[PDB]
């Protein structure tokens, strides 16, 4: 569906062109491998990385900036919890989240309009299903 | 060119095969001192797969042997820095392994191209 596809399209370009382009951000492009960091999942409850966000976008998980940002926010919060607040990992994670937020403000009004249209479409489907 | 097709083939080994080794991502780009501060103290002749791709894009490699020297240096470097028994060195060894296998699946083509890159050098010298 048209508006949801357009909305996912934009989120995906934010991930690929901006978030993944943060210098030295490579370790956040991949899930942490529990064989090599055996305590990571003792500490981190809800893992996330940039390749998983891309997979979620391709399946239209996100109908709104808010559910996209809940997964982006985990990138920072997990790094703080596992790698520590003054770790170079965490400095890189903050940059990843900062570019995402700054990019999304450039597209504010258009993403507001696409969210409204996704919701109007959805509503039309439900009342229409009766 | 023999060189354009040769470089194409090497780049596809790096991206398709060597970068596909599981958990090989730490070898895909140069180490940053900000993450590994003693790394360039220990490793005086650094190498990574992105660097090999830039080398290929500049046609630095005229033969498999010059290409393999850089590939092998990735393993020689992991040996010194991470240690001979390190998990990272087992991956580096696997990257080295899949490079050698893929070169074989392309032997005849690469030989043709490698011969023709010389023919050009001698045409140059004969004309010089």
């Amino acid at each position: 569906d048209d508006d949801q596809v357009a909305f996912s399209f934009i989120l995906d370009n934010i991930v690929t062109q901006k978030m993944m382009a943060v210098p030295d951000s490579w370790p956040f492009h991949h899930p942490v491998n529990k064989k090599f960091v055996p305590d990571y999942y003792k500490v981190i409850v809800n893992p996330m990385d940039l390749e998983t966000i891309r997979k979620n976008i391709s399946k239209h998980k996100y109908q709104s900036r808010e559910s996209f940002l809940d997964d982006v926010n985990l990138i920072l919060a997990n790094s703080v919890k596992y790698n520590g607040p003054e770790s170079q990992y965490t400095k890189t994670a903050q940059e990843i989240v900062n570019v995402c937020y700054q990019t999304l403000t450039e597209y504010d009004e258009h993403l507001t309009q696409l969210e409204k249209d996704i919701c109007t479409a959805k509503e039309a489907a439900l009342e229409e299903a009766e | 060119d023999d060189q354009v097709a040769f470089s194409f083939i090497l780049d596809n080994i790096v991206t398709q095969k060597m970068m596909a080794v599981p958990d090989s991502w730490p070898f895909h780009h140069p180490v940053n001192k900000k993450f590994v501060p003693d790394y360039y103290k220990v490793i005086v002749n650094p190498m990574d797969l992105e660097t090999i791709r830039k080398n290929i894009s500049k046609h630095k490699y005229q033969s498999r042997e010059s290409f393999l020297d850089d590939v092998n240096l990735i393993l020689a470097n992991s040996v010194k820095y991470n240690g001979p028994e390190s998990q990272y060195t087992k991956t580096a060894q696997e990257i080295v392994n899949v490079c050698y296998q893929t070169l074989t699946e392309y032997d005849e083509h690469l030989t043709q191209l490698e011969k023709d890159i010389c023919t050009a050098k001698e045409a140059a010298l004969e004309e010089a």
Binding site: V37, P38, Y40 | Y88
Partner: peptide
């Protein structure tokens, strides 16, 4: 913090 992922990301 946990035990740490080391400088290179895989321990």
């Amino acid at each position: 913090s946990g035990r740490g992922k080391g400088g290179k990301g895989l321990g």
